[PDB]
């Protein structure tokens, strides 16, 4: 909180927005890049998914709500309809950011983002385990 | 080997030429509409879903298969 002042509201509202926000960013592109963004955004929602899954609840029901929570894309309780709002850490049901809602520090994601992408391009390179 | 697909081309027109008459209201061919129809529902895959964005996306997925079936074949 105090050393990292810049934080992103929500951990799952950031998720399903980035689905759309990248889907839009995908939608703008075409060719492979529209796909090359798409399935990247289709790697996202599992993060709130395993949450409610491990909560013995339906993440699809929960994550589609955040997906359903928008007009354009952002995370606020201000318009919790017209944008994304928060998350429930015991569920994945969006929590009002300031009240029960999630906030995530700035580096938490940009670091979590790239490494998986770093790991993704890694195995992708390797076709040969070849031995004697 | 050449001749028949001409004769087929003749009957193709008279069908959809008369079908251009038959239904006055006409949409762009070649799967043109289904393209945005994917968006429009993947809008609703965004928009409504409690869940069925799966359903809505699965549906919208079925739209552009044909021009994908066409160009790729």
What residues of chain A lie within 8 A of the CB of B50, using their CB? 61, 64-65, 68
A60 touches B: beta carbon within 8 Å: yes
Judge contact between A67 and A20, C-beta under 8 A. Answer: yes
**Are B46 and A67 a contacting pair at CB < 8 A?**
yes
Q: Can you give the resolution of this entry in Å? A: 8.5
**Shortest alpha-carbon distance between residue B14 and chain A (Å):** 36
Cα gap A41→A25, rounded to integer Å: 10
* DSSP run (H or E) holding A7: strand A7-9
Q: Is the dihedral of CA B60, B66, B72, B73 positive or negative?
A: positive
Tell me which residue of A3, A15, A90 sits closest to A47, measured CA to CA.
A15
* DSSP run (H or E) holding A107: helix A106-124
Tell me which residue of A39, A47, A37, A52 sits closest to A16, measured CA to CA.
A47
Closest CA in chain A for residue B40: A27
Contact residues of B toward A, CB < 8 A: 39, 42, 45-54
For residue A110, CA distances in Å to A36, A97, A117 come to 19, 20, 11
**Are B45 and A67 a contacting pair at CB < 8 A?**
yes
* DSSP run (H or E) holding A64: helix A59-68
What residues of chain B lie within 8 A of the CB of A70, using their CB? 46-47
Which of A27, A61, A68 minimises the CB distance to B39?
Answer: A27
Buried (b) or exposed (e) across A65-85, using 16+ Cβ within 10 A?
bbbbbbeebbbbbeebeebbb
Judge contact between B42 and B2, C-beta under 8 A. Answer: no
**Joined tokens for residue B42:** 């993947």
Buried (b) or exposed (e) across B31-47, using 16+ Cβ within 10 A?
beebeebbebbbbbbbb
Closest CA in chain B for residue A62: B50
Name the structure determination technique. Answer: cryo-EM
Tell me which residue of A61, A27, A63 sits closest to B38, measured CA to CA.
A27
Judge contact between A10 and A102, C-beta under 8 A. Answer: yes
A67 touches B: beta carbon within 8 Å: yes
What residues of chain A lie within 8 A of the CB of B58, using their CB? none
């Amino acid at each position: 909180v105090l050393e990292s002042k810049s934080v992103v509201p929500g951990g799952g509202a950031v998720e399903a927005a980035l689905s759309i926000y990248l889907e839009n960013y995908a939608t703008s592109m075409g060719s492979r890049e529209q796909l090359a963004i798409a399935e990247f955004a289709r790697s996202l929602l599992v993060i709130p998914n395993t949450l409610a899954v491990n909560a013995a609840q339906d993440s699809t029901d929960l994550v589609a709500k955040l997906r359903a929570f928008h007009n354009e894309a952002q995370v606020n309780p201000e318009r919790k309809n017209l944008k994304w709002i928060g998350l429930d850490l015991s569920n994945g049901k969006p929590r009002d950011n300031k009240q029960a809602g999630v906030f995530e520090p700035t580096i938490v994601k940009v670091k979590s983002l790239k490494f998986a992408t770093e790991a993704a391009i890694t195995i992708l390179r390797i076709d040969d385990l070849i031995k004697l | 080997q050449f001749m028949e697909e001409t004769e087929r081309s003749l009957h193709d027109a008279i069908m959809i030429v008369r079908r251009a008459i038959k239904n006055d209201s006409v949409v762009a061919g070649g799967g043109a509409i289904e393209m945005e129809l994917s968006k429009y529902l993947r809008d609703y895959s965004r928009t409504i879903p409690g869940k069925q964005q799966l359903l809505i996306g699965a549906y919208a997925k079925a739209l552009e298969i044909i021009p994908r079936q066409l160009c790729d074949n």
